[PDB]
Motif scaffolding. Structure first.
Motif, short mmCIF file in Angstrom:
data_model
loop_
_atom_site.label_atom_id
_atom_site.label_comp_id
_atom_site.label_asym_id
_atom_site.label_seq_id
_atom_site.Cartn_x
_atom_site.Cartn_y
_atom_site.Cartn_z
N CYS B 541 -6.08 -21.75 -10.75
CA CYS B 541 -5.39 -21.61 -9.48
C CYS B 541 -4.00 -22.21 -9.63
CB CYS B 541 -6.16 -22.29 -8.34
SG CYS B 541 -6.46 -24.06 -8.58
N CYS B 582 -11.55 -29.47 -10.83
CA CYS B 582 -10.62 -29.06 -9.80
C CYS B 582 -11.36 -28.77 -8.50
CB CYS B 582 -9.84 -27.82 -10.23
SG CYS B 582 -8.46 -27.37 -9.14
N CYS B 584 -11.12 -25.70 -7.60
CA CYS B 584 -11.54 -24.37 -7.99
C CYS B 584 -12.61 -24.38 -9.07
CB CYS B 584 -10.34 -23.56 -8.49
SG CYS B 584 -9.82 -24.00 -10.16
N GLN B 586 -12.13 -25.75 -12.07
CA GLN B 586 -11.50 -25.96 -13.37
C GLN B 586 -11.61 -27.42 -13.78
OE1 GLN B 586 -10.25 -23.54 -15.36
NE2 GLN B 586 -10.02 -25.13 -16.93
N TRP B 588 -10.55 -30.87 -15.26
CA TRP B 588 -9.28 -31.59 -15.31
C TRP B 588 -9.26 -32.72 -16.32
CZ3 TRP B 588 -6.62 -32.48 -9.91
CH2 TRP B 588 -6.23 -31.24 -9.41
#
Ligand SMILES: [Zn+2]
Ligand SMILES: [Zn+2]
Lengths: 640, 640
Positions: B541, B582, B584, B586, B588
């Motif tokens: 994103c 994340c 979303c 994802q 990190w």
RNA sequence: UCCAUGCGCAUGACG
RNA sequence: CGUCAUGCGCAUGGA
RNA sequence: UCCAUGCGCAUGACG
RNA sequence: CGUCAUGCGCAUGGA
């Protein structure tokens, strides 16, 4: 592995050990015929339990890759060993070992030729045609002169004659392999009569040592079943011609010919050479400028004058950059005159440029053509620059985009003509897009003509050379040549065997003796091999640039001048390793950063030679022309 | 200390102060030759009463430990001082002091290199090759590029050239030590001809500044007395390929290649990078998913599809956990589509999985093999995962247990490939069991190939790379390379001394100048060193994640974001410090609990950079790539 | 003895 | 120059 | 995968 | 024998 009947009949003679030729129309899948021949020959040798080898030779690497991917390997994955050798593919085992293994081999001619030369030389990597038991050649029509195929086969012919002499006077004879031959069409070259075409065919047969040609004259039905038109449609020019006449008057030059022909360009080159032999100005420099102007005229005759403006703009901007760099770290009267004569008209010349031309006519033709039509299209032309020009120009037009006509350029990979080459990968990618449909039309010089797998093309347009279009009589002569070749083949097939043998024997002897004289003359060519007997000068300004002993060599390929004294002369330039130019703006060479050294490598094209014997100046275009040799650089010196 | 005759002859040149190389077949005990050389050299220096030092360098710590335990110390317990230095062993005295003491030293190269760098730097811990009087190197074949051995020896070469210049122009010359060289085989790399192999050998000699190579060509009898074969043997795939084609259609992606090759994977990575540069979906996410699918295909091509199912199950279960954590504290259309496209077929895919395959064929081979035979066995492969798969699969089978075949896996210790590494202690334990016999067969990637003391092995099977077995042409090229290397050594040994000196001098100069240009380019690499000029975004994103100044550094190794504002974005996950993902889904980074602070450390691989200059997005995979520097965290702030 | 992190190097395959 | 796999070495920190 | 260099060959047009 | 254009092949080196 089933074999078609028409294929079967032509293949039959080869199965008996006859070295023949096999020419079939494109699309008949003669590759499968070659695979069948190979399998049968290897099976026969297996029954006899002897060395079964085949060396398939193809003049293009793309063909070797395709044969490995599609025809030979898939049909022979199981029984025998196969390898798709080529020069671009990095292998890990040398070629002689590949001969000692890998029963079936797909390669390229010059690799085998290099190995044979090494055998003849002291590199100790050996290979002989005796090792192979069969040789298969694709596109045999290229075996007409001293090309690679003929260079390979001349050794075989010489060995065959020695074998005949041994047989007659001795018991043992060195074995020689069978020789197959494949070609879409034997072709006819420099032929005006049936006699000349027949002589050409006999020459090809002698070069291949073929027994007979073979075609299909009984099963033509299914062949025609499987295998299946000519259309024809300013003030800037005279303005530029006025400038050309003005510069001629300024130079007292007699062209002897007209403007816009190779005659004028050749005369310009000759006068450039003469001027270099005189060390004078306003002749060499003006020769180059007139060369550029004649090129501009020629491209304008077939291309929009905007491209001629781009050419001249690039040339004169580069000249301005050269002179500006020279000023850093004055301008000659000739350079001043020419540059002012150009710049004073550049803006008005451009103003003329937009004013409306073969290009517009071809546009009118092709836009109408695209209304008929999946859609496919092809265009042929001569120059690489023309392809870029047509691509960008058709992109500029909106009608083609409206119709959905997407076009892309296509050229070869050779590093010449001062144009950006196209890589093999990019060619593959473009052809893949063309098959998929991302691009509807192709613009090619000669690549798409052969080799490239371009097919299902409705339109094929030739612009200055299954609907066919020729924008701009050559089709008539092409058809006549085709008919003459077919008649010559028909005649040669129907001939007495002994007369054919005698003629081919005579041709073989002639070729061998000619090669012998070529070897004699080549040996007699180089005789001096002197260390330092010359001096190099700038061709524009007849000034001393280098001596004969201060030069050194790296890689036995590049010539450089390490001496500090030399470095105080040249200037560096670069825009977008670096380029080296004179104090007068003449280009000298390139700055190669090699082996941790910043070598100022130079080119011979742009210099002039002065022998210590006071012999007249000379131009060579290549270092190998002169026989004198230069020493190899020693890194111990200059190490510092 | 008695010395064998063939050993004696090769060792003789070194006793005279010649810096040479000594290559002997494995098992000839060249370590004792090195010990004899060391003792003789130190005795000679004792007679001369000068600084007698030796620095033995070995590329692996296991070798240093073994030399300390078995060969050097036991033979020299009495006279001289010895120390088994290494990086893993905690010592109490620094390295320069170890040089000031401990006459004989066994160490690892990079330790000495670090000390030399510190000398060059301001750490004040100094050491120089002048301090040593002799250098012994094991596995010299690794001294071919900028590896540690060559990095050490290039300094010696530079110092030698400076010494030659001083000698010629000055009286004093800095002393330099003798240099010995040991290797099982000099090896040949990227060689297709005797010329290239000879060039490689000369390069190795120049890197080692050797005088001559030495082998045994007269006492081969007892050597052969002491020192003493290639065998070669679905619907799930097409189902998965159907899903792959479906997702390609969903994404309008043109692969340009086939499925199950590195080409497709590389294209997927390139398109992932491009998508990250565009901040778009269905391209990056689908790029990762296609990467996983291609990996599944590749492993299935050599491994049972059950393992591909396990891989995909782990991947999608992790995805489900990520999305569930995101829901805590919605799903994108792309994620919905892909997850539903997988789950709808997972059960039937497993049903296909049990249906019967290189694996079963290899089983049929090895079960037959074990009927012959103390019993020993070895297996080689490529991937770490393949070792675990084979181990658990052979455990599942009952026939191997019936035969008494006990097998265990073996891999390296590197922290990469997303696999559980094996520790040095566990490797030692496994090899000890193998010697004892608790495990009859070993499964290794490359560790058992060299370094590990694996011997008395009847069977050695290579699966996709003293009976030898190769399940799946490379042996032929390996034998050819061995023969070519032997011929090159034979040639180089028989050469004029002055030509050899000139060639090695040229190679040394070339290497030094290349290193000089490397230093220049490395210095020119980093130039910006800016505090905050970028912004970090999530690659999936394209949302703002961090600024350039809110980042801080701990240990000069980890980058963290202390700002509270950032903490409101990410989510935490953990299953079995914690992992940071994340909004979303994802990933990190990781939650590092360091120095009494709960630092949310993040990784650069999974973020995308946006410069303040609006330069195009970039991916780095490592912080050091960019030259801009970030400030070090100050604990006074945030102390609270 | 185990765990986490960073950096560097080499080999093989591929483009 | 890029991708993947494999192996190695060094430097930090914690239990 | 890209870039630079050298060499050789063939075709077409022209002189 | 020379000039121009086009295409091809091989051999080096570097990223
Ligand atoms: Zn000049
Ligand atoms: Zn995100």
């Amino acid at each position: 592995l089933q074999l078609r009947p028409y294929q079967m009949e032509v293949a039959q003679p080869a199965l008996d050990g006859k070295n023949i030729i096999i020419c079939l129309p494109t699309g008949s899948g003669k590759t499968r015929v070659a695979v069948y021949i190979t399998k049968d020959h290897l099976d026969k040798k297996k029954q006899a339990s002897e060395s079964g080898k085949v060396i398939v030779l193809v003049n293009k690497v793309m063909l070797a890759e395709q044969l490995f991917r599609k025809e030979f390997n898939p049909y022979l994955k199981k029984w025998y060993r196969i390898i798709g050798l080529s020069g671009d593919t990095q292998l890990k085992i040398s070629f002689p070992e590949v001969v000692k293994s890998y029963d079936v081999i797909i390669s390229t001619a010059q690799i085998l030729e290099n190995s044979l030369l090494n055998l003849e030389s002291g590199d100790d990597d050996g290979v002989q045609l005796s090792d192979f038991s069969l040789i298969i050649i694709d596109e045999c029509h290229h075996t007409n002169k001293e090309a690679v195929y003929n260079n390979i086969m001349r050794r075989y012919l010489k060995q065959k004659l020695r074998n005949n002499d041994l047989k007659k006077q001795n018991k043992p004879a060195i074995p020689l392999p069978q020789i197959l031959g494949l070609t879409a069409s034997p072709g006819v070259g420099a032929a005006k009569k049936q006699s000349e075409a027949e002589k050409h065919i006999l020459n090809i047969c002698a070069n291949l040592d073929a027994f007979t040609i073979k075609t299909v004259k009984e099963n033509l039905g299914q062949l025609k079943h499987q295998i299946k038109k000519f259309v024809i449609a300013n003030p800037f020019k005279e303005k530029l011609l006025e400038i050309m006449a003005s510069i001629q008057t300024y130079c007292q030059k007699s062209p002897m010919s007209d403007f816009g022909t190779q005659h004028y360009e050749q005369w310009a080159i000759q006068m450039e050479k003469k001027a270099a032999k005189d060390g004078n100005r306003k002749d060499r420099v003006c020769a180059e400028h007139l060369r550029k102007y004649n090129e501009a005229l020629q491209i304008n005759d077939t291309i929009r004058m905007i491209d001629a403006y781009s050419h001249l703009e690039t040339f004169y901007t580069d000249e301005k950059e050269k002179k500006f760099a020279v000023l850093n770290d004055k301008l000659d009267e000739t350079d001043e005159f020419l540059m002012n004569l150009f710049f004073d008209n550049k803006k008005m010349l451009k103003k003329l440029a937009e004013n409306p031309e073969k290009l517009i006519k071809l546009r009118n033709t092709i836009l109408e053509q695209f209304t008929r039509s999946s859609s496919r299209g092809i265009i042929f032309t001569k120059t690489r620059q023309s392809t870029y020009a047509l691509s960008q120009w058709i992109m500029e037009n909106a009608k083609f985009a409206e119709v959905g006509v997407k076009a892309h350029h296509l050229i070869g990979a050779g590093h010449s003509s001062e144009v950006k080459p196209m890589t093999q990968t990019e060619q593959k990618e473009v052809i893949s897009k063309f098959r998929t449909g991302e691009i509807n039309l192709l613009i090619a010089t000669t690549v798409a003509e052969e080799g490239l797998d371009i097919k299902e093309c409705n339109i094929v347009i030739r612009y200055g050379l299954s609907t066919y279009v020729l924008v701009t009589e050559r089709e008539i002569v092409n058809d006549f040549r085709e008919k003459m070749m077919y008649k010559a083949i028909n005649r040669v097939q129907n001939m007495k065997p002994e007369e054919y043998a005698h003629k081919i024997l005579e041709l073989q002897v002639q070729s061998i003796l000619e090669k012998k004289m070529k070897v004699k003359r080549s040996i007699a060519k180089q005789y001096n091999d002197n260390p330092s007997l010359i001096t190099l000068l700038c061709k524009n300004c007849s000034m001393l640039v280098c001596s004969g002993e201060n030069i050194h060599v790296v890689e036995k390929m590049h010539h450089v001048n390490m001496t500090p004294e030399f470095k105080g002369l040249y200037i560096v330039r670069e825009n977008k390793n670096g380029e080296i130019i004179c104090k007068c703006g003449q280009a000298w060479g390139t700055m190669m950063v090699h082996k941790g050294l910043d070598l100022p490598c130079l080119k011979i094209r742009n210099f002039v030679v002065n022998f210590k014997n006071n012999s007249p100046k000379k131009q060579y275009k290549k270092w190998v022309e002169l026989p004198i040799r230069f020493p190899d650089l020693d890194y111990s010196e200059y190490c510092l």
